[PDB]
Design a protein around this ligand. Structure first.
Ligand SMILES: NC(=O)c1ccc[n+]([C@@H]2O[C@H](COP(=O)([O-])OP(=O)(O)OC[C@H]3O[C@@H](n4cnc5c(N)ncnc54)[C@H](O)[C@@H]3O)[C@@H](O)[C@H]2O)c1
Ligand SMILES: NC(=O)c1ccc[n+]([C@@H]2O[C@H](COP(=O)([O-])OP(=O)(O)OC[C@H]3O[C@@H](n4cnc5c(N)ncnc54)[C@H](O)[C@@H]3O)[C@@H](O)[C@H]2O)c1
Ligand SMILES: NC(=O)c1ccc[n+]([C@@H]2O[C@H](COP(=O)([O-])OP(=O)(O)OC[C@H]3O[C@@H](n4cnc5c(N)ncnc54)[C@H](O)[C@@H]3O)[C@@H](O)[C@H]2O)c1
Ligand SMILES: NC(=O)c1ccc[n+]([C@@H]2O[C@H](COP(=O)([O-])OP(=O)(O)OC[C@H]3O[C@@H](n4cnc5c(N)ncnc54)[C@H](O)[C@@H]3O)[C@@H](O)[C@H]2O)c1
Ligand SMILES: Nc1ncnc2c1ncn2[C@@H]1O[C@H](CO)[C@@H](O)[C@H]1O
Ligand SMILES: Nc1ncnc2c1ncn2[C@@H]1O[C@H](CO)[C@@H](O)[C@H]1O
Ligand SMILES: Nc1ncnc2c1ncn2[C@@H]1O[C@H](CO)[C@@H](O)[C@H]1O
Ligand SMILES: Nc1ncnc2c1ncn2[C@@H]1O[C@H](CO)[C@@H](O)[C@H]1O
Lengths: 427, 427, 430, 430
């Protein structure tokens, strides 16, 4: 019926949820407005997202809207046991825990495919692991699936690659590229959870350190800003000249890893790309350099090299390894190269996840309630809905939004109700 | 042949240009690479942009590429006399000076329409004043015009309105919405020139003051950040819930002008919208509140109200008026509500304008060299060219850009040469 | 008879040692002290009773003192601040330590009393943090005062107490104000809190900082850091203050400065840093927004009226250790961290090890100074020489790869100054 | 005989007055002084010779001193710092002022000499900024020293000189160090420079700050502000320093700290703030990037080797007043601002009027203190009482709508402190 580390944590879990709800006004309005309507009636939503306190509230929201949900984790150390327990206690099949093996991980996603009253008809994925599993292993269920929504940047890039090669057989909504997700989650989320992750693992001082951030997209920007705020000297690496110039214009030295590896005290990878930190970098690092990743998959840091070339590996505590190298110096690796904010901390705070997840619900609704508008392709949520997500969070922050007058709306040639920006606007 | 305030300033002008060139690597590469090719051969580019030191370098670049240029200003107090003089000294008809009347302003744009060897075949406008003049007054020249490029946000919004109502008869390239413009010019440009404008006019202390910024788009963001940096408490107003939430997430109180007018020491309008600061606001302002605008046209502040309701208007010096109100308190107005960074300072520094203008040249080229790709419509510059502009500025900043390996480029499914981002990416 | 020590779990010793090994690499100031003095053992014959948070950083300090030849017995200066694996590591090393996380007020007093007597005589040196060890001896063990050579005090509240004792003529032992060493006050209090405050809030609540209104009471060194950290994460910070100079500083930095009576209606997060009583009261609690987070980082739990929450709330739910969620008659909730005790050490690991190396290098120097040069220090409250203050900073420049400029002989003569310092006059504020 | 004054253009008086009217609204500290003392005229019989930048802000100070019943004669303390319309406004008010923008070194000395003698006796009070007026009298007019009741000194370089004179036994008049009033040092030097440095660079060059590498030499109060301002606009700031404590501060704030020998190869902008000679030399100039901007904001033009640029450059082109562009043998160019003189006042209008109100309120208090309570001040260098220091800050809280908290009687007794202050011990560094 489910699978977790300890059901006895459900009580504590429920508390952490009650607290989360006040921090998630977005998702609460959805429950407020759709509870009686039950738009998601008939939908069996198979989920593969980090089983956390924040996700628990999302899972319960989908249920409040009248759906059946089965949940797996998308990372083997991201799950929060007490959050997984409260959900499991509510009669909702959840298969996830903290510290899964790859075989265990794959085995979890498999339990969420089949419900009591039939296979899954909805995917809510991030990274596309569930998406790619059903496309490769279970292509006989693809026709039964009505729609899918993708949370993260790497997962939508994959959804664009599949569609191009004509192997994407199910319609999909790019939830990452809702402004309210990409511009808040990736940025402000990592901005607050990065250092938290590093701190819990190492308790290292950030001030006075040189920190090297590989990549300056939305995630890199947040990471950079955070480290800067605590008095680190931040060095950026980048392949994109536009992003690189943005970093230079903010006062960041922009150079290569081949150079930066020699002066960094702290290393954070955010590229979504392979081969970012390699043996030739490690060998040049200062003693007890702290290396961690916050990209979606654990492919940015060459962990294999450390395991193969170090003289000794000492485990300090879970998700914290200290390698001694043949040069005598040591490398502190976090979460074995898996994303550090969920691996060594609690991931993003509930408020920002409310934004991401208020998007996710609108996407699950729009795929199940209006399947017409969305044919087999990679689609966006309309700006007006994107605006509605943001608007829904203004109350809690005591933001007082201005309303255009008739005269002003005419002068601008837009509606008082929105949308207020053209589609190409970048905020 | 031309019209300026003083040709005797040309010598000083030339110096300020020689200095500008080192700060404008973007535009220098264009001269380096196209001088011999003369792609703009045959093009008579009528220009309506702020006649400044930065613009002078742009004008000369278009000439270096083999074009005939006639230049007018787009604002009546933005022109820099010594810059206008150096251009006029180089045998290039320029009709612009600092302190023009509306009749003088219109009269300037009119001289740039007709060259020695025929009418204009290219527009390089901002705000769309030249665009709208030729469409309304001289529709007989529209067919002779090959293409147009628009610098600023208000001007492209107008170019979208014209196309919608089917009155835009000439193809146009949205240069504002090149990432390299919108994300650098509007943001980093105003970030540095706003306070400069305010300082030269008033020399007021920013620290300890409450500053009210109306609008939180790219311009508002820059203004807000700047004022914050000097220790002002910044209050934002906004109509867009997405922008408003962005401001809240940066630590800015977001409320209405109706409230903020009561506590602001400094007022900056950035909306591009009418009726932002009104009589009911002025009456509530603290004594010697400094009010200024940095949107493109002078329609955001109700200057007419001040002139009609104040008990006395005292001029402190050019572009600085001090009104005494019937309540006894005083309002310090800058530049009569026209944009303050060009009115009371020198506008944006050359480096950022190099970015904007390296875009402008590519747009002038693409309209004159490849007219096929661009039919009557509002078009964007391709990302690869957008990336090239940024790349061209990395050298001067000693930025060392990373190059993807073959293996990495394959994994990402993109080219080593770019483009590195999908079209919907927002940076 | 006498327990050799008392800690939560001796089994945590191995883990603690690892944390000690890592910490050492971040505390060059103390490691230089060991290297320089391990052979000479200046603190030989010293019997130092230490009352100060039993963290990993303090462990490194303890072993430094021992390396210098001292005998050391230790307790924590707060009931929630001990880090059990660090305690175990010390206990396992054969050093008498009496501390664990979650002490009763009575157990806390007991822990201090076990540090007072050594196998070969009473304590003859004091290393204190808040004055609790200092007051206990002056009040309950005055016959031990002539046998104590000196006192070094870590924190602001503590040195304030020292100065009051001196003015009223009741301080009987010479003391060094370590808090007001430049390399402590301007670094520990400021930069340490700037990182550890958020740490304690996050571990306890995992709340989004961005978009919140945060009220910081007091704008001294601790307040400055706290405020900076919160605004850094996108919170709008409001400041309360009684000192017009500190308040003007806050305003000049772009903070709204106002009273708690006003700010209690706005804040989503409250942080007290005053070292003063009665900062947040019932009348404030009753006006707060729902699930307002309330915590203190001043030395003593006296700034927040927790007893009011306990007597007047209609519900009280323990969320997890050092996190309680009250509900008031108005039906709105208050989250209280660490029962009003200082939240960085209560709900997290306190200051990072690097900045603590500054503070603790000052502590070691002070101990050496009082122990080996008593006649320099008559009964009173003294500062370390600026020369030594500068040496502390210098000892940490290497790790950060700072390259310090050296004055030419001409420049030094122009400034009327020694090349080797001191480089500032006594009244310099940095 | 004796000119009543000498200024650039008396016609600029009307404009200056407007600027004076505006400035007054931003200088509550001085305007409170007028209101409180205009009737009592504590400075009656005083004959104050002032040597300090003749800006709009100083004008407001001058008229404040007169309102208090003083006779005042004024000159500028720098040859490029005078604001001619402000000078005209004062001259027109019938106050003898000798100052204009662009003085020769010889004219500068002449200007000071005209302030020394009044219609009814020699000067009996000194208000100085850098010690130039102080040194001139001690060296060339020692027979005037017994007739001078006191000296108030504005800036760091000046008070350094005062302390040296006292140590060597050559200072003959009592003096108040105004620079090291908290409300001066921690505000003027820091917040003022944070705004006026960029001002001077911008007016002179209009250069993009964002993306540039900026080298700030020295990290004291001036350096802190300068550095902060540059990084705020998106420059990557590199710091040089001789003091290990100041250097550690810089590092802790995320700045690269290194030597000028290293940084001269990287910087696009250079800013000296040391108050020390020989900061930027020929060997540094020769390694700089093309069109590197070089300026100083320390009090004297001694930090940059301008004479080297003048003797060794192959080209020198004046771009505009106080902006010269050199070319070296290597064919790369150097832009020098204000001929090495302090660039905020040289190429702009100096500090904004609000923060100068702090400094100048301290100046007025010092003048009153020395003039009406001489016996409090024997020959030496003294500080203002913290009570008065606090009063300065308090006088400026109203304009910023700061709401200061008042201690309850219980809180005050707990802190062992007066409700009306002073709220900090003497050694507090804020
Ligand atoms: N840990 C989390 O909670 C979390 C949250 C959001 C996103 N993510 C993940 O973070 C990664 C990026 O997210 P983003 O939204 O920042 O994507 P993004 O595309 O905005 O940023 C990626 C940046 O990496 C740069 N880059 C790529 N290869 C590089 C290389 N070899 N060297 C240097 N720079 C390189 C690109 O130029 C790009 O700017 C993705 O894997 C996404 O799934 C994680
Ligand atoms: N002065 C300069 O040098 C300079 C440079 C670039 C752009 N601009 C001008 O600045 C203006 C905006 O530029 P942008 O790129 O910032 O455009 P933008 O659309 O990003 O920002 C405009 C913001 O104004 C807000 N807004 C509109 N009406 C409002 C109202 N009544 N109250 C509050 N907020 C309101 C919108 O929500 C939007 O976010 C345009 O007029 C543009 O031409 C000037
Ligand atoms: N938890 C830690 O790790 C840590 C670290 C350093 C210091 N401390 C403690 O923190 C407290 C403050 O340290 P500090 O060095 O910042 O002291 P400080 O004296 O520099 O600043 C304290 C501020 O509180 C202000 N204040 C006093 N009463 C007030 C009131 N009723 N309302 C508002 N403001 C008020 C004072 O004016 C002063 O500015 C002390 O108790 C010290 O021991 C704790
Ligand atoms: N232009 C203005 O408006 C203005 C305002 C205030 C002060 N000042 C002047 O600015 C100068 C500094 O003022 P401050 O109060 O910042 O003095 P300060 O003594 O606080 O800091 C000066 C710094 O320079 C450092 N230093 C000395 N020699 C050095 C060297 N060779 N290399 C690197 N660093 C070195 C010192 O260590 C010190 O930290 C003084 O001359 C003062 O009069 C000017
Ligand atoms: N606490 C959280 N719960 C669920 N998903 C999260 C959390 N924090 C970050 N994420 C998501 O994890 C993904 C990274 O793989 C991103 O899409 C990001 O939004
Ligand atoms: N110095 C300058 N020269 C020319 N155009 C400028 C300058 N500074 C800002 N602008 C442009 O002015 C427009 C505002 O009307 C924007 O498009 C902006 O890029
Ligand atoms: N990690 C830590 N270990 C020991 N003492 C600490 C730590 N962090 C902060 N402190 C001390 O706590 C005191 C507050 O009571 C401060 O004086 C500070 O030196
Ligand atoms: N606008 C100004 N008017 C007068 N003096 C000023 C101004 N700005 C800075 N100063 C003074 O210049 C001195 C530096 O020589 C500082 O002590 C400072 O007080």
């Amino acid at each position: 019926p489910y699978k977790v580390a300890d059901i006895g944590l459900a009580a504590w879990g429920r508390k952490a949820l009650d607290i989360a709800e006040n921090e998630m006004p977005g998702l609460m309005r959805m429950r407020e407005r759709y509870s009686a309507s039950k738009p998601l009636k008939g939908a069996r939503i198979a989920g593969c997202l980090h089983m956390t306190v924040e996700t628990a509230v999302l899972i319960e929201t989908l249920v409040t809207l009248g759906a059946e949900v089965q949940w797996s984790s998308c990372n083997i150390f991201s799950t929060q046991n007490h959050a997984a327990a409260a959900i499991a206690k509510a009669g909702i099949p959840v298969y996830a825990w903290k510290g899964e093996t790859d075989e265990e991980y794959l085995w979890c996603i498999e339990q969420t495919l089949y419900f009591k009253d039939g296979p899954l008809n909805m995917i809510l994925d991030d990274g596309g692991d569930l998406t790619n599993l059903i496309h490769t292993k279970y292509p006989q269920l693809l026709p039964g699936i009505r729609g899918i929504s993708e949370e993260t940047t790497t997962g939508v890039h994959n959804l664009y690659k599949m569609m191009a090669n004509g192997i994407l057989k199910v319609p999909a909504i790019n939830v990452n590229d809702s402004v309210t997700k990409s511009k808040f989650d990736n940025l402000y989320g990592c901005r607050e959870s990065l250092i938290d992750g590093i701190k819990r693992a190492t308790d290292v001082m950030i001030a006075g350190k040189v920190a090297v951030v590989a990549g300056y997209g939305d995630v890199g920007k947040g990471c950079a800003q955070a480290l800067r705020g605590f008095g680190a000297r931040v060095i950026i690496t980048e392949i994109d000249p536009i992003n690189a110039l943005q970093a230079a214009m903010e006062g960041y030295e922009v150079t290569t890893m081949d150079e930066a590896c020699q002066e960094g005290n702290i290393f954070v990878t955010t590229t979504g790309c392979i081969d970012i930190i390699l043996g030739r970098h490690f060998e040049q690092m200062k003693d007890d350099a702290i290396v961690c990743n916050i990209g979606h998959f654990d492919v940015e840091i060459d962990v294999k090299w450390l395991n193969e070339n170090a003289v000794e590996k000492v485990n300090i505590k879970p998700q914290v390894d200290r390698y001694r190298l043949k040069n005598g110096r040591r490398i502190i690796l976090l979460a074995e190269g898996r994303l550090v904010n969920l691996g060594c901390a609690m991931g993003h705070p509930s408020f920002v996840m409310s934004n991401s997840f208020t998007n996710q619900v609108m996407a699950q609704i729009e795929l199940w309630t209006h399947p017409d508008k969305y044919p087999v392709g990679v689609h966006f949520l309309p700006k007006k809905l994107d605006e509605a997500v943001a608007c829904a969070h203004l109350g809690k922050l005591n933001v007082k939004l201005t309303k255009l007058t008739e005269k002003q709306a005419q002068y601008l040639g837009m509606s008082c109700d929105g949308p207020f920006k053209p589609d190409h606007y970048r905020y």
